[PDB]
RNA sequence: GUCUACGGCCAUACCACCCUGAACGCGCCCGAUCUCGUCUGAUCUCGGAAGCUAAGCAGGGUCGGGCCUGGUUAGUACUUGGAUGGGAGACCGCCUGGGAAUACCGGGUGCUGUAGGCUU
RNA sequence: CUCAGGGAGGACAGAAACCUCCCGUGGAGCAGAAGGGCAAAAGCUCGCUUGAUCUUGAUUUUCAGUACGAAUACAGACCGU
RNA sequence: GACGCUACGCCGCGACGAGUAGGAGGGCCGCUGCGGUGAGCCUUGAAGCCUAGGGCGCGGGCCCGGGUGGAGCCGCCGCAG
RNA sequence: AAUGCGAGUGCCUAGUGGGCCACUUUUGGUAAGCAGAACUGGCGCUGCGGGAUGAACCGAACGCCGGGUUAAGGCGCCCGA
RNA sequence: UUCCCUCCAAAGUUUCCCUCAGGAUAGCUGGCGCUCUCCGCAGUUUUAUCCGGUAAAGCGAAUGAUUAGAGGUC
RNA sequence: AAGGAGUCUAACACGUGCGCGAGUCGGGGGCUACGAAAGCCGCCGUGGCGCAAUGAAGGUGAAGGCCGGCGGCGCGCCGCC
């Protein structure tokens, strides 16, 4: 019941990232922010949560 | 005084405001456009479906009576499993009664 | 502006394939189409009677009427704000059985067989089509040799 | 790739999907220089898609580790083989640096290419890094430090911290 | 900001009757109390139909009432009408009927009471069956009005039997060019 | 093993040349009174059974041509989406996904449905 | 029945008249502009003919999904071959 | 044994808030006249006008204080322009 | 199959029917802040932070406020850093 | 082209017109609701199944254009 | 500073409120200060609109089924009570 458990949760209203974004317009492997940051989404989670 | 000739620039955005909806799918679509000979014969079949009505009930009631002789011929842990059973408002009623009678 | 001709821009669309000209084969004649069959439309330029219009080439619909040499097909058409259900009379050489519903019917009979099965055995067998999951954790054997070291090659001006 | 900070030096092993044709593909090891492992895997797939016919969806990353410097307390000569793009043409190079770590030498190489030839990190393509003996070096900027009795002074010590005594009375001294 | 669309945020539906008549507005208070204090959906439908306009509660004929209460199973039940029960004079026999309606016409009332049935109002229905049990909700033909013959696909279009707007009907009133195969075309 | 009548997919079946075909068949073949048609019984139609596998036909062969199917070409050319990337431009590089086609080099050279034969 | 074209031959006859053999996937032709299509044919030559006739509806094309024009499947008749 | 409930009233949870052309709703916003109604106001001072005065309402606007003035004026429920 | 969302339906209906700009594709032209198309997003209708200035560029769209943090940009002085 | 606030919110596109500074028509908008709920639908993907003749490529493959030698018999 | 521009009548459509309801409507006429108002008429409902359509028109004008008996056709059909 992951579909029901996830749809029960409202989408998370998170703040702006403390410290700052690297580059919003480019991908993460280009030294930016967009796309898949595999293990490094937690580093954004602590500064944004 | 030359003016713009033709464009479709905003049209795809105008179409999706009220949506691009498929036609209304209904069961029993109309027989209008079906060929006249087969359509004429289907009307003759519908006209005389009532003719063999008394023979039709003699088979369907036979099948319903044979239904009687057909159907009467055949006729994650133990700790969390116990605690979720006690926590049940109805199934764990006597188990909760036992716990309430455990401290006297 | 363009012309409003019926066969404008159909030069490669209604042309025969390479070395596939000549006499039309007879299996497209001696196959059976009934009402409710799902049929895709592909115009063939060898026969000229009963040709579908160019906006129905590559489309798929459902047969509602069957005649001596032709079938009538209900095809969805995108017109300028909306989709209409068109009823077109196409002669039988432009007509092919679609295989999209065939996999669904073979899955329906498989699901019904697999539901009749495992009802007396009491187990529960998966009937939904799950999407491609992440692959399970596995061991890769580098038995013997070490992995080969790859390096970028230097440039060669071969122009 | 953006050469962010200092680079870390990764050993990346990958392979193809096991198929009924190829039931076990050969494993391919590469020596990637990247700020992190997420960039390292992407650069691995870039290089191996350039060399072999294997893509990210048609293959997998079997291993991705940071392999360290075996001796970061001795100074070493590093020879680096380059392949870069200019504004008109692409060229190979061999450059020499003096550093304690291989990844530090390659990090210095990226700043050197950006400084001297305005070569951005996406055009720079490192192809071989090797520890070089001091008798095998070629560049005189590196061979001048191969001296047992090396000696130089610090001749013109420019005064930093110009704003903590910001309004001062004595004029600064540069001789030390 | 969010990329939502505020086009359909306000639903149009009626919250209250637009009429200011105080006898209807007391029945609205009664069934508004009943709809929120009972779990019966009958009171909700009756309360929503009390809000509606005159065209949305068309009158029932007595003959349509006889046929919709003659059906099997629904004997000894109360026919509940939100509109008006009008007399239908092309019927000869009237059985006894227990009637709840907002209005009953004077000649239909005589026929029902001579047949021997009862005619209730909605406060009487609320006293008798508060949850509306043993009742048959009925409503008039909503497409019975003449306005609906002019609606749909336009006239002068293939396969459209829509009544046009004419000042009068006759031989020379819109019967020539879009109607004849002789003069022009026929759709 | 294989043939005949009628076919299905229409070259893995076509084209060139060579070799071999037991039995049944298919043919070539012998004739023009009748049926039929021509300038001409060559074709078509008809009546046959002396001779022959010569040819058609079947099987096989050719570092065969073609065709079919793979590899290479090549993750190349091209391309979805992205950047306050580069360049004076022309254009190019990178990120994210998809991914061709020649030349060149291998393999193959009809499968099969119904009915009826021969190999008793 | 097979075309365009080509090769080898045959009195006058030659670049080019007619006859014959062979190769010929269309390199011809199908009224016209172009495109598509077509080989025991949709081309050429014959034989017989008038379905280029009467009559409802439906459909497609342009399209507003209106007409006109053109077109496609039928159905009811009388016919041609 | 507090308050409540002008039910066209009161109360509680969430989410949301750009706007030309344009459309709709609410105005205890404003002007003039009429039917009702305030045992309404007024020579112990109406309308109007002025005001470095006190305020209310998001706003349209409104209520008080001072002065000027000398004879009529306003609130609420509906109606009309 | 996954993900997400309450949908369906009927009347009456204003304004508009001069557009323009940008990535990519693209026609004519030597070219044009030129003329003409496709797709999507904008400006028109729209303020705000940045590009000194500024219809369209980058970021981000707006009820009245307090605290905190950011985007695109920046951090000698003007001018916050 | 004369007061306030609140809510929703465009188009310079199709077809026809002695139509090109304008109308009608469709589209975009608003208002009024109603029928249900308390299966259906989607400017999206996955899995099957069809369609194409652009980018590219080819001219030792047809058509058209086109450069050079080489080997040949009559 | 004052005046100053979507009004009035008729017709139609749609929505909404009221009354009566297969009916409804006295608008014209008549009877009996405000009041030129209000009330009343029903053998004053004439007449309008609705309750019936369709055809150019002559005209026509809005479910049937079963059973028994009889007649005809060769067990079914037609006609007839
Ligand atoms: Mg901070
Ligand atoms: Mg951008
Ligand atoms: Mg224009
Ligand atoms: Mg907001
Ligand atoms: Mg809005
Ligand atoms: Mg709205
Ligand atoms: Mg002979
Ligand atoms: Mg032979
Ligand atoms: Mg032989
Ligand atoms: Mg070969
Ligand atoms: Mg066989
Ligand atoms: Mg023939
Ligand atoms: Mg707003
Ligand atoms: Mg003043
Ligand atoms: Mg322009
Ligand atoms: Mg807008
Ligand atoms: Mg903006
Ligand atoms: Mg500037
Ligand atoms: Mg703030
Ligand atoms: Mg600045
Ligand atoms: Mg003007
Ligand atoms: Mg094309
Ligand atoms: Mg090209
Ligand atoms: Mg004024
Ligand atoms: Mg009305």
PDB file of C-alpha atoms in Angstrom, chain C residues 83-135:
ATOM      1  CA  UNK C  83     -12.141  14.522 -31.965  1.00  0.00           C
ATOM      2  CA  UNK C  84     -14.961  13.236 -34.164  1.00  0.00           C
ATOM      3  CA  UNK C  85     -16.106   9.660 -34.751  1.00  0.00           C
ATOM      4  CA  UNK C  86     -15.984   9.297 -38.543  1.00  0.00           C
ATOM      5  CA  UNK C  87     -17.733   6.527 -40.476  1.00  0.00           C
ATOM      6  CA  UNK C  88     -15.777   5.651 -43.617  1.00  0.00           C
ATOM      7  CA  UNK C  89     -16.451   2.982 -46.250  1.00  0.00           C
ATOM      8  CA  UNK C  90     -13.120   1.428 -47.193  1.00  0.00           C
ATOM      9  CA  UNK C  91     -12.654  -1.337 -49.758  1.00  0.00           C
ATOM     10  CA  UNK C  92     -11.031  -4.483 -48.444  1.00  0.00           C
ATOM     11  CA  UNK C  93      -7.529  -4.147 -49.958  1.00  0.00           C
ATOM     12  CA  UNK C  94      -6.755  -1.124 -47.734  1.00  0.00           C
ATOM     13  CA  UNK C  95      -7.732  -3.088 -44.661  1.00  0.00           C
ATOM     14  CA  UNK C  96      -5.684  -5.162 -42.216  1.00  0.00           C
ATOM     15  CA  UNK C  97      -6.420  -6.867 -38.891  1.00  0.00           C
ATOM     16  CA  UNK C  98      -4.711  -4.972 -36.070  1.00  0.00           C
ATOM     17  CA  UNK C  99      -2.617  -7.061 -33.673  1.00  0.00           C
ATOM     18  CA  UNK C 100      -2.874  -4.610 -30.756  1.00  0.00           C
ATOM     19  CA  UNK C 101      -5.971  -6.277 -29.297  1.00  0.00           C
ATOM     20  CA  UNK C 102      -4.525  -9.769 -29.905  1.00  0.00           C
ATOM     21  CA  UNK C 103      -2.042  -9.527 -27.022  1.00  0.00           C
ATOM     22  CA  UNK C 104      -4.833  -8.287 -24.744  1.00  0.00           C
ATOM     23  CA  UNK C 105      -7.072 -11.227 -25.717  1.00  0.00           C
ATOM     24  CA  UNK C 106      -4.223 -13.708 -25.184  1.00  0.00           C
ATOM     25  CA  UNK C 107      -3.707 -12.084 -21.772  1.00  0.00           C
ATOM     26  CA  UNK C 108      -7.453 -12.296 -20.981  1.00  0.00           C
ATOM     27  CA  UNK C 109      -7.519 -16.032 -21.709  1.00  0.00           C
ATOM     28  CA  UNK C 110      -4.288 -16.461 -19.705  1.00  0.00           C
ATOM     29  CA  UNK C 111      -5.769 -14.523 -16.762  1.00  0.00           C
ATOM     30  CA  UNK C 112      -8.993 -16.547 -16.870  1.00  0.00           C
ATOM     31  CA  UNK C 113      -7.027 -19.814 -17.010  1.00  0.00           C
ATOM     32  CA  UNK C 114      -4.770 -18.640 -14.163  1.00  0.00           C
ATOM     33  CA  UNK C 115      -7.854 -17.623 -12.152  1.00  0.00           C
ATOM     34  CA  UNK C 116      -9.538 -20.997 -12.678  1.00  0.00           C
ATOM     35  CA  UNK C 117      -6.182 -22.427 -11.614  1.00  0.00           C
ATOM     36  CA  UNK C 118      -5.004 -21.706  -8.026  1.00  0.00           C
ATOM     37  CA  UNK C 119      -8.583 -21.415  -6.768  1.00  0.00           C
ATOM     38  CA  UNK C 120      -8.543 -25.028  -5.548  1.00  0.00           C
ATOM     39  CA  UNK C 121      -4.911 -24.702  -4.398  1.00  0.00           C
ATOM     40  CA  UNK C 122      -5.617 -21.577  -2.336  1.00  0.00           C
ATOM     41  CA  UNK C 123      -2.574 -19.536  -3.386  1.00  0.00           C
ATOM     42  CA  UNK C 124      -2.510 -16.042  -4.918  1.00  0.00           C
ATOM     43  CA  UNK C 125      -0.943 -15.456  -8.337  1.00  0.00           C
ATOM     44  CA  UNK C 126      -0.150 -12.033  -9.793  1.00  0.00           C
ATOM     45  CA  UNK C 127      -2.478 -10.934 -12.608  1.00  0.00           C
ATOM     46  CA  UNK C 128      -1.594  -7.241 -13.003  1.00  0.00           C
ATOM     47  CA  UNK C 129       1.209  -6.254 -15.360  1.00  0.00           C
ATOM     48  CA  UNK C 130       3.792  -4.678 -13.139  1.00  0.00           C
ATOM     49  CA  UNK C 131       6.221  -2.202 -14.738  1.00  0.00           C
ATOM     50  CA  UNK C 132       9.949  -2.925 -15.004  1.00  0.00           C
ATOM     51  CA  UNK C 133      11.259  -2.877 -11.420  1.00  0.00           C
ATOM     52  CA  UNK C 134      14.767  -1.989 -10.253  1.00  0.00           C
ATOM     53  CA  UNK C 135      16.946  -5.055 -10.680  1.00  0.00           C
TER      54      UNK C 135
END
